[PDB]
Amino acid sequence: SQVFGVARIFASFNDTFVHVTDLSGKETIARVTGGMKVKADRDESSPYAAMLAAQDVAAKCKEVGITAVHIKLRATGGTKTKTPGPGGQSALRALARSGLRIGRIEDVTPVPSXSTRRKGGRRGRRL
RNA sequence: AUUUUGUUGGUUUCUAGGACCAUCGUAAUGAUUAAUAGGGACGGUCGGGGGUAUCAGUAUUCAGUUGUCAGAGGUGAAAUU
Ligand SMILES: [Mg+2]
Ligand SMILES: [Mg+2]
Ligand SMILES: [Mg+2]
Ligand SMILES: [Mg+2]
Ligand SMILES: [Mg+2]
Numbered sequence: 517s518q519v520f521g522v523a524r525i526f527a528s529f530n531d532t533f534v535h536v537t538d539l540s541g542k543e544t545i546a547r548v549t550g551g552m553k554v555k556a557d558r559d560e561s562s563p564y565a566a567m568l569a570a571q572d573v574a575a576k577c578k579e580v581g582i583t584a585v586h587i588k589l590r591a592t593g594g595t596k597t598k599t600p601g602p603g604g605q606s607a608l609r610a611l612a613r614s615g616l617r618i619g620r621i622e623d624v625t626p627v628p629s630x631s632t633r634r635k636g637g638r639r640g641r642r643l
Numbered sequence: 644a645u646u647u648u649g650u651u652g653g654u655u656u657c658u659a660g661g662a663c664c665a666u667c668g669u670a671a672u673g674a675u676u677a678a679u680a681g682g683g684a685c686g687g688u689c690g691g692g693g694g695u696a697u698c699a700g701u702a703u704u705c706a707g708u709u710g711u712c713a714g715a716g717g718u719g720a721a722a723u724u
Contacts (some may be wrong), residue, residue, distance in 0.1 A: 530717065537710080544711040551714065558674090558720065594702060628702035 518617055521577065523585040524624075527604025528592045532566040534573045534583060534607050546576035550603050566603030568609035577616060584617035591596055593626035595634040600625075 522541060526533035532550035537543055550565035559565060577585070587608060591600045612618050
């Protein structure tokens with residue numbers, strides 16, 4: 517029936533990656549980041565830039581034959597935040613509205629089972 | 644050792660007092676509770692109590708292979724990178 521890729525969306529609080537691979541993930545089909553759509557660093561992670569990034573990904577996906585994708589959303593994870601960035605919700609909605617078909621959706625944020633020391637010091641970063 | 648038998652002094656048994664030694668007889672013969680103090684034992688437990696080994700887990704970083712291609716990072720905004 518459909519031809520599935522995997523839309524690996526990495527939405528941090530400084531950028532948004534829309535990366536579509538095959539099922540294995542060893543073959544990259546399209547990787548458009550929110551920073552390729554704006555000329556200001558402060559909104560590389562904006563919802564607007566993620567939507568534009570996803571639309572360019574969907575157009576590239578169509579001409580290769582990818583008709584559906586699975587979604588693997590992730591945040592920065594590790595010792596840093598586990599909540600997804602603001603661009604991850606827009607890139608997901610843009611892909612669904614671009615004619616691409618959606619399969620399984622999963623959060624694949626890396627989560628430690630403890631962990632290493634997190635940056636900032638004992639008193640945190642004082643603002 | 645007072646006292647003799649007094650004519651004065653020697654003799655060692657009764658004697659009395661210890662002080663002990665054995666036997667026998669008397670006797671209701673002789674050991675306070677177990678502290679809602681403690682200690683100890685014992686019986687099933689219960690704990691992220693300790694020590695010595697041992698076995699996970701993802702994460703972080705670094706490296707190897709792969710894939711694409713222009714940015715990535717970081718911030719209130721940036722720049723160093
Ligand atoms: Mg400092
Ligand atoms: Mg303050
Ligand atoms: Mg008692
Ligand atoms: Mg015991
Ligand atoms: Mg019980």
